[PDB]
Amino acid sequence: GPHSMRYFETAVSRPGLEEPRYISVGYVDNKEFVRFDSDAENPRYEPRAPWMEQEGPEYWERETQKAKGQEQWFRVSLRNLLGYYNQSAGGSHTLQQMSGCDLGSDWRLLRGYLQFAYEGRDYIALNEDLKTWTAADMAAQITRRKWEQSGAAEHYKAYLEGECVEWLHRYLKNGNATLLRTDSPKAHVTHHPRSKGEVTLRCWALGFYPADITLTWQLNGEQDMELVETRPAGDGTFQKWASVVVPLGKEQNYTCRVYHEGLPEPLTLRWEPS
Amino acid sequence: DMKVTQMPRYLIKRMGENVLLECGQDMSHETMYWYRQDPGLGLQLIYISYDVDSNSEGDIPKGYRVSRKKREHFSLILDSAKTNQTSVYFCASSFGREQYFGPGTRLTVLEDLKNVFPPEVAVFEPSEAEISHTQKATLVCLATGFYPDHVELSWWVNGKEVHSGVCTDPQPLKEQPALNDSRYALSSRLRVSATFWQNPRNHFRCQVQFYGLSENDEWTQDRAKPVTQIVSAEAWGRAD
Amino acid sequence: AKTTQPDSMESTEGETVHLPCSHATISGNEYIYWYRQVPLQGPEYVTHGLQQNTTNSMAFLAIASDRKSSTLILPHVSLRDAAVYHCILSGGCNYKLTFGKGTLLTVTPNIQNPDPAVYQLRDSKVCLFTDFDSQTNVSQSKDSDVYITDKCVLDMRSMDFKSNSAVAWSNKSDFACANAFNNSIIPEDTFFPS
């Protein structure tokens, strides 16, 4: 099926710190596989997935040296941004970046990504053509003009269509069985009493992977639903629940449909009184 | 638009003295550099500065230190100058595309200032035979006996500096080729039409700017102090 | 360091100049930059490229399909193009450049109407060998008291004229313009005024 790779980078400055903290996290198919943190006693990229543990020492050394260059890039950029926004002293500031590639089921490159944020808001992004930039405001227009004049997009396009795709292929080969591993939701419906002639029905979806899931309540297979946002269980799997307010004695007329990748077909659930 | 400034173009220092070379860049580029270039060799990086107080040693940092307190300036310091530090120093800056280089500072570090001499300058008027054979007239300027090779020769016609019809030797000659401390000679030619030369109102001046000893440098030798100075020679047009 | 260039290249004005550069070990994000440095002034950027051939006002850059070699092409070279040309790899994420020796390009002028001659200039209160074609080579003196410069080209753009010249001078008693350039192979038709 389709695949992806992303690196999510963050640098945070603060008055009490002489140098910004830098964190880089790599993901393959939305699962963390590598991490670098400047706060560690010995900062280095480390494997975050066991299938990455077989990469030799030259790989770890090469990635770690790149992170040192990124820390400098982010440090200088943070200082420029403080100037662009004429920000006052005594504040903490955040520069973030996302980059990577999306691959189709037929292995073609669907899209390259490159985006930046300052203070948690879009700053500048590389357009889908991998040639032009979108600047979010007046300060980002200063950056856009700089990057157009220096030809920055060409460097980013070459990485996104080349090296990004090549390495994603290599990781997919190593993490083959592990990355294709899905966990089906184990589902059940709970009964909760209410005021008047009414009752709450809660459809629980547990132990599933990946996080993408759909829970749908229906009245005879065809009010606004209440739910919780998908949450991590702590073991690598996810949880979710969806609820409906129904009249007393009418519980069996309502069904909860669970849609997930790991299931051979959608689940159909109902309140089963013990 | 993009200009890196470096002054002076030339400097003489005694061995063991402190040296400070300054560089400016009003573009406020983050990245600045100090290189040195020895004759016939490519530039060698001494230090790079990624930003204010963010300096990293280049390929040849020994004997130098730098200072970058502001983005617009980058200083190179020689705490105790060695004669092997005689070189042309180029500062550079970058915003992420190419590097922009300054015009360079030629630094000559000498054991003592005893062999420092300004040039003698003489102008040689056109040959009458050249005039009749070609209808052109070449003037020759000779700058001789100077040391070190710290000169800028220019021609001035009716009080205006000229470049057209001029050729100055790209390198000086040694007046005593078998000596390591030989004084130098340089020649230049200015060619005009015979008609232009034949007008007695036309004034031709060969100017040699010599970069010598500082006004503050000590001098006890029994001859004039060889300070930075202009030495000129001139000729006027001749109808004859 | 990673680039290899010939030490020197000879050319004639108006000709197409191809300056080669070998860089077999080039990495995927290394740009190929060309800088030039005129006599003793600061280096100056000429052009650069990553994978694609580049055309700008100054030159044309041709990069091989495998990216292991490149060529800087200077169409119709002028006298002004004589310089050392440096081919350098520049990593896309860093600010460093390692300069090598580069290629010293000489540009000789096309002498239209040569009129080789040796003149004596009027004394100051020197001998000039001029108007010879760029085929003529002037040698140094086989006398320590005689000074002879290398040839120099001057350009009189006011009248689209160029001329080569060399100067000889001495204070020595046996020095004369008729013998000044004796160690040089001078043209047969060289004019010596009486």
Binding site: K66, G69, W73, F116 | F95 | -
Partner: peptide, 10 residues
């Protein structure tokens, strides 16, 4: 394999 940003800063 992580990206190293083109050397021009923001």
């Amino acid at each position: 394999s992580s990206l190293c940003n083109f050397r021009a800063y923001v």
